[PDB]
Subunit: 258 residues, 4 copies
């Protein structure tokens, strides 16, 4: 596999639906050794099961809201992985009220702070915490959405948070590049996940994208998985600070329904 010899930490595996689940399956297929985080105790058991089906018993708590939890993650991981080769940030949150209605009516200071803190800051927070553990040739990866570039109904403040996160990719790639670390994002098209369900009229976005995307289907966690595996491998040694659209080309289409 093109990840033979790599040790990648994967965040954000909530279920078999999760983008991060797809990424893990592809990275295991390509020979990566994997470790896994879980947000809270409620999620531990399922992530342990998913971890074990991929030959891993490295499963550790991380609530990215808490600096101590991020430090503890890497404190505990260092004991099995003194050094490793990067991680997948597949984590977003905003209060539910932020994702239904007029952006300006519905956005709040606290909704804004949480969305950016959890979806944007958490990525560089994780990087600070493991910086000295990363081998030369390491790769970090986050997940963004066209909401960052365009005004999308109901996505609302998550658009601002993804725009922040995509700038984070750039500032992180620029800072960590010299010492041999690449940083990228996948801008993924719509996929049915627990989190997707939190966006008002998600199913309308999903249907619309299926119709007008050049490849004429919604992308799968397999498609994202393979792209993510590639971006965290030495195959992508020439790419850093990049937001790669894995949306079937939806972002480049205009006026297809009239």
């Amino acid at each position: 596999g093109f990840l033979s010899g790599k040790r990648i930490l994967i965040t954000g595996v909530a279920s078999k639906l999760s983008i991060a689940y797809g990424i893990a399956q592809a990275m295991h297929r390509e020979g990566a050794e994997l470790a896994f985080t879980y947000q809270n105790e409620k999620l531990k058991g399922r992530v342990e099961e998913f971890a074990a089906a991929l030959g891993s018993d490295i499963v550790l708590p991380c609530d990215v809201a808490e600096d101590e939890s991020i430090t503890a993650l890497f404190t505990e991981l260092e004991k099995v992985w003194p050094k490793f080769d990067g991680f997948v940030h597949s984590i977003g949150f905003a209060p539910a009220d932020q994702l239904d209605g007029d952006y300006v009516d519905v956005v709040t200071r606290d909704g804004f702070k949480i969305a950016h803190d959890i979806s944007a800051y958490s990525f560089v927070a994780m990087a600070k915490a493991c910086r000295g553990m990363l081998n030369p040739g390491s790769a970090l990866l986050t997940l963004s959405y066209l909401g960052a570039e365009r005004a999308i109904p109901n996505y609302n403040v998550m658009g601002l948070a993804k725009a922040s996160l995509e700038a984070n990719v750039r500032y992180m790639a620029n800072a960590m590049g010299p010492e041999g670390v690449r940083v990228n994002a996948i801008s993924a098209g719509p996929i049915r996940t627990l989190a997707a369900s939190g966006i008002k009229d998600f199913r309308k976005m999903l249907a619309h994208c299926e119709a007008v995307t050049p490849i004429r289907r919604t992308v799968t966690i397999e498609d994202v998985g393979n792209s993510a595996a590639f971006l965290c491998s030495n195959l992508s040694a020439g790419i850093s600070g990049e937001v790669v659209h894995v949306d079937g080309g939806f972002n480049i289409a205009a006026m297809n329904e009239l």
Copy 2:
């Protein structure tokens, strides 16, 4: 005066000194016939801002600390007393703790540092829009000030780059939300200009010199260049333009591989 903003009432935030981008905008809007009102952050800036306002024929000078929801509500409660309706506002406000703007981004970025940059530099634009939405006339325009740091990794600009990316996305979401009721929302991506707050960016004087050398117009932009651009974007001349980040940087942003 009389000009392309005759009939417009515009609120101006972020005047600190005569170097301030908001001063150049205030100058340019007065010259084009706008009635102006001003905000000041704290008591330290009140007196300075009052004399600037009086020189431009305004005695509407009101406190606003955009970290505080109470302060923004009270701004527009007081503003309503003299201006029941008005035609929008200029958001010329940035802030991060000093420690954010000096060193390797990953090393010096902090959670509070990130929180404060995004809160003051990005959230505060839509906060002001939420609290004055009902007072905006049809044909109103909101304007904010961004920087190329939103688009490119700039040494030492660090977490302000992310807060500016968030700001530019806010322009788009607000434009989209407010367009149907007749409100336009735009940004100017200004080139570097020696302002009080600019002195806080490590190596600013090298940015300035770099930008002077490679910018197509072969000069630094002025608060006059930005003021004329802001005056246009808040005027009915710009009626076909919403959700845009207009680069007023002499075209620095389109240059690569110079020298």
Copy 3:
């Protein structure tokens, strides 16, 4: 006096009262410009003479941008009445009709691609080459582009490629001509019913779509584009070069609005 007082601006692409260039001409004359006009061929000469006369000009000269000799003769004739001037509006676009109906790969041809690029993109720099010595300090060039440059729009086809080339032309001309005091910008205009627009398949559906989903909830007008164009060729926009300004009511920044 208007913000174009003391400027001498040459206007191409006036075909009718619906032409973008005619809206530009009106706004620029309103703001105090003195104007000169080109006409493509003998059939348009009379109408352009009439529209120019209505804006206080009888400087009305043939220019077919297909021909190097025609562009040279234009500036050799112009110089006799305008030894110096302050820039020109390039409002010129053409591809063979067969290029703008069907699947882009089926319908695009080598000659169709050549003509689109030659007339719509190359002509902007050919004109700049031909008058470079006649431009005052503070001169400004303007071309017209379309969202088709950035996105794949059905049936705009190879005109999308020609517009992308044109916007790249804006950047390379801004960068080359900036040091000698010349600014170069584009307006990326929303759809407008003009003679040329009727050559685009389902243009009526395009208008209705942009009408529904554009933040400002209307079509832009030649007044909107004219006002922006006046601004971009005036000293008010002295800070802006190498820029494609979207004058499309925010259409470009909206996604999934139809639902």
Copy 4:
């Protein structure tokens, strides 16, 4: 390998430094059957040799200035490859005079025509001539440069031709997507190739990019090759109409003192 069972045609192999060389190596290594084109008789020997090193004896002429040359390529290719899974367009040309001096002084109608014709039109010309030979799941790839997005000294009219090429990618991705074909570009950082010599002060561009690129090195035909292999493989199934920057992140950097 992840191109196992794919048939890819490769253009623009000139020498061992050729981006198209790096791409052939990477695609061979991952188990693609390759075919190669050569511009003219002068290059035919070098390519027949490079092809044989990779196990291909499919080496056909194509001058993309000629519609007939493109038809004939696909007429000959069909005899051995009735179907195939796409091609790599690694082809650029402008008259030498275009790439030395101030853009406005140096550009000419004929300079502009050829740059656009060879560097941009030829990509969709090849897609037109082979559309019915492409299997479901096929990928086309072209090579672009940041000259499309930024004004770069001396790159001049090639910048416009690459901007047209990048738009081409999007219009081809939109048209061909529904019949199961993806179309993408790599925007490669500077690399010393035969063609690169043609740019005035190319050396300075290399050293500039090397100094300020986040990965702090020049990219290689093997970095571009790995990215090209990926983008023409089923691994990239969710990517179309995309210009992927393989320049070490140079494009996102500004103000490196």
